[PDB]
């Protein structure tokens, strides 16, 4: 967006020496076929386990029984003959 | 020698229109922006990463 100087104008570009025209043109680089080499193993001996863990520990229980329940020799009360 | 046997180092396009033509101290000044020092005597590094 330059302003044209009317007192000192200039013309378009003139030819100048050039950079040997084939040396600015590249070759198209020619890929050969390739292979991810080797026979891959199916599994890996991992350093960490792959499953979930638990944040807190919960107390577990198992039921037990008591035993054969016996009789008893109670201390027996007195007879309510109007004193009680 | 520390640059005193080189006039300049450069990286030209085709055989014409250089892109970084520098004396051996301006060349080493661009290396000091990279590795915060400069290489031993005779070694010149050019970064194009």
mmCIF file of C-alpha atoms in Angstrom:
data_model
loop_
_atom_site.group_PDB
_atom_site.id
_atom_site.type_symbol
_atom_site.label_atom_id
_atom_site.label_comp_id
_atom_site.label_asym_id
_atom_site.label_seq_id
_atom_site.Cartn_x
_atom_site.Cartn_y
_atom_site.Cartn_z
ATOM 1 C CA UNK A 1 0.000 0.000 0.000
ATOM 2 C CA UNK A 2 2.841 2.366 -0.871
ATOM 3 C CA UNK A 3 2.250 5.778 -2.407
ATOM 4 C CA UNK A 4 3.691 6.393 -5.862
ATOM 5 C CA UNK A 5 6.310 9.136 -5.918
ATOM 6 C CA UNK A 6 5.467 11.240 -9.004
ATOM 7 C CA UNK A 7 8.771 13.120 -8.967
ATOM 8 C CA UNK A 8 10.955 9.996 -8.754
ATOM 9 C CA UNK A 9 8.987 6.971 -9.964
ATOM 10 C CA UNK A 10 10.504 3.593 -10.738
ATOM 11 C CA UNK A 11 9.685 0.720 -13.059
ATOM 12 C CA UNK A 12 9.198 -3.000 -12.556
ATOM 13 C CA UNK A 13 11.964 -5.479 -11.782
ATOM 14 C CA UNK A 14 14.720 -6.029 -14.340
ATOM 15 C CA UNK A 15 16.411 -9.425 -14.887
ATOM 16 C CA UNK A 16 19.304 -10.223 -12.550
ATOM 17 C CA UNK A 17 21.718 -13.207 -12.346
ATOM 18 C CA UNK A 18 20.024 -16.441 -11.372
ATOM 19 C CA UNK A 19 20.728 -19.448 -9.132
ATOM 20 C CA UNK A 20 21.334 -22.204 -11.776
ATOM 21 C CA UNK A 21 17.719 -23.314 -12.336
ATOM 22 C CA UNK A 22 18.007 -27.085 -11.811
ATOM 23 C CA UNK A 23 19.634 -26.577 -8.416
ATOM 24 C CA UNK A 24 16.372 -25.121 -7.072
ATOM 25 C CA UNK A 25 14.461 -28.238 -8.196
ATOM 26 C CA UNK A 26 14.544 -31.234 -5.822
ATOM 27 C CA UNK A 27 14.397 -34.969 -6.404
ATOM 28 C CA UNK A 28 11.259 -36.810 -5.281
ATOM 29 C CA UNK A 29 12.947 -39.030 -2.664
ATOM 30 C CA UNK A 30 12.137 -42.644 -3.561
ATOM 31 C CA UNK A 31 10.780 -44.746 -0.629
ATOM 32 C CA UNK A 32 11.641 -48.466 -0.413
ATOM 33 C CA UNK A 33 9.421 -51.001 1.363
ATOM 34 C CA UNK A 34 9.861 -51.578 5.077
ATOM 35 C CA UNK A 35 8.975 -53.936 7.875
ATOM 36 C CA UNK A 36 8.490 -53.811 11.626
ATOM 37 C CA UNK A 37 11.101 -56.448 12.306
ATOM 38 C CA UNK A 38 10.913 -59.571 14.423
ATOM 39 C CA UNK A 39 8.221 -61.921 15.680
ATOM 40 C CA UNK A 40 6.370 -60.180 18.503
ATOM 41 C CA UNK A 41 5.706 -61.893 21.812
ATOM 42 C CA UNK A 42 2.081 -62.224 22.861
ATOM 43 C CA UNK A 43 2.371 -61.066 26.470
ATOM 44 C CA UNK A 44 4.726 -59.115 28.724
ATOM 45 C CA UNK A 45 5.862 -59.769 32.299
ATOM 46 C CA UNK A 46 4.599 -56.450 33.587
ATOM 47 C CA UNK A 47 6.137 -54.692 36.626
ATOM 48 C CA UNK A 48 2.716 -53.586 37.929
ATOM 49 C CA UNK A 49 -0.548 -55.462 38.295
ATOM 50 C CA UNK A 50 -3.278 -54.505 35.842
ATOM 51 C CA UNK A 51 -6.243 -54.772 38.201
ATOM 52 C CA UNK A 52 -7.964 -52.554 40.750
ATOM 53 C CA UNK A 53 -6.886 -52.024 44.335
ATOM 54 C CA UNK A 54 -8.757 -51.115 47.504
ATOM 55 C CA UNK A 55 -8.293 -47.872 49.420
ATOM 56 C CA UNK A 56 -9.463 -49.115 52.825
ATOM 57 C CA UNK A 57 -9.530 -52.532 54.461
ATOM 58 C CA UNK A 58 -12.836 -53.921 55.714
ATOM 59 C CA UNK A 59 -13.125 -56.340 58.620
ATOM 60 C CA UNK A 60 -14.433 -59.757 57.586
ATOM 61 C CA UNK A 61 -16.236 -62.209 59.852
ATOM 62 C CA UNK A 62 -17.066 -65.884 60.074
ATOM 63 C CA UNK A 63 -19.816 -67.433 62.172
ATOM 64 C CA UNK A 64 -19.023 -69.690 65.122
ATOM 65 C CA UNK A 65 -21.209 -71.735 67.429
ATOM 66 C CA UNK A 66 -21.336 -71.745 71.202
ATOM 67 C CA UNK A 67 -21.688 -75.218 72.682
ATOM 68 C CA UNK A 68 -24.155 -77.498 74.393
ATOM 69 C CA UNK A 69 -26.209 -75.374 76.778
ATOM 70 C CA UNK A 70 -26.525 -76.909 80.240
ATOM 71 C CA UNK A 71 -28.920 -76.487 83.133
ATOM 72 C CA UNK A 72 -28.241 -74.566 86.314
ATOM 73 C CA UNK A 73 -28.738 -74.674 90.068
ATOM 74 C CA UNK A 74 -30.599 -71.443 90.766
ATOM 75 C CA UNK A 75 -30.871 -69.859 94.180
ATOM 76 C CA UNK A 76 -34.568 -70.007 94.652
ATOM 77 C CA UNK A 77 -36.740 -67.346 96.325
ATOM 78 C CA UNK A 78 -38.769 -67.672 99.491
ATOM 79 C CA UNK A 79 -42.505 -68.325 99.586
ATOM 80 C CA UNK A 80 -44.783 -65.267 99.488
ATOM 81 C CA UNK A 81 -46.548 -65.848 102.801
ATOM 82 C CA UNK A 82 -47.481 -62.136 102.980
ATOM 83 C CA UNK A 83 -43.850 -61.090 103.622
ATOM 84 C CA UNK A 84 -42.553 -59.712 100.333
ATOM 85 C CA UNK B 1 42.289 -22.065 17.087
ATOM 86 C CA UNK B 2 39.503 -19.883 18.466
ATOM 87 C CA UNK B 3 38.148 -18.565 15.189
ATOM 88 C CA UNK B 4 41.392 -16.943 14.002
ATOM 89 C CA UNK B 5 41.760 -19.283 11.000
ATOM 90 C CA UNK B 6 38.229 -18.845 9.604
ATOM 91 C CA UNK B 7 36.926 -15.886 7.632
ATOM 92 C CA UNK B 8 33.258 -16.875 7.850
ATOM 93 C CA UNK B 9 30.916 -19.839 8.052
ATOM 94 C CA UNK B 10 27.718 -19.998 6.052
ATOM 95 C CA UNK B 11 24.762 -22.107 4.943
ATOM 96 C CA UNK B 12 23.986 -21.506 1.267
ATOM 97 C CA UNK B 13 20.951 -22.239 -0.819
ATOM 98 C CA UNK B 14 21.428 -23.637 -4.293
ATOM 99 C CA UNK B 15 24.850 -22.075 -4.949
ATOM 100 C CA UNK B 16 23.534 -18.614 -4.385
ATOM 101 C CA UNK B 17 21.599 -16.606 -1.755
ATOM 102 C CA UNK B 18 23.230 -17.429 1.610
ATOM 103 C CA UNK B 19 20.969 -17.632 4.653
ATOM 104 C CA UNK B 20 23.395 -17.232 7.579
ATOM 105 C CA UNK B 21 26.806 -15.845 6.590
ATOM 106 C CA UNK B 22 28.571 -14.875 9.809
ATOM 107 C CA UNK B 23 32.080 -14.233 11.083
ATOM 108 C CA UNK B 24 33.402 -16.714 13.712
ATOM 109 C CA UNK B 25 32.304 -14.522 16.649
ATOM 110 C CA UNK B 26 28.792 -13.765 15.429
ATOM 111 C CA UNK B 27 28.577 -17.495 14.700
ATOM 112 C CA UNK B 28 29.632 -18.255 18.271
ATOM 113 C CA UNK B 29 27.144 -15.661 19.537
ATOM 114 C CA UNK B 30 24.275 -17.715 18.105
ATOM 115 C CA UNK B 31 25.715 -20.766 19.873
ATOM 116 C CA UNK B 32 25.752 -18.944 23.218
ATOM 117 C CA UNK B 33 21.983 -18.517 22.906
ATOM 118 C CA UNK B 34 21.772 -22.328 22.621
ATOM 119 C CA UNK B 35 24.103 -23.974 25.153
ATOM 120 C CA UNK B 36 24.870 -20.887 27.348
ATOM 121 C CA UNK B 37 28.604 -21.201 26.571
ATOM 122 C CA UNK B 38 30.639 -22.056 23.509
ATOM 123 C CA UNK B 39 32.280 -25.295 22.348
ATOM 124 C CA UNK B 40 36.062 -25.991 22.535
ATOM 125 C CA UNK B 41 38.549 -24.455 20.115
ATOM 126 C CA UNK B 42 37.814 -25.423 16.535
ATOM 127 C CA UNK B 43 34.273 -26.724 17.064
ATOM 128 C CA UNK B 44 31.437 -24.853 15.341
ATOM 129 C CA UNK B 45 27.796 -25.768 15.866
ATOM 130 C CA UNK B 46 24.820 -24.997 13.626
ATOM 131 C CA UNK B 47 21.303 -25.467 14.974
ATOM 132 C CA UNK B 48 18.465 -26.407 12.628
ATOM 133 C CA UNK B 49 15.979 -27.998 15.011
#
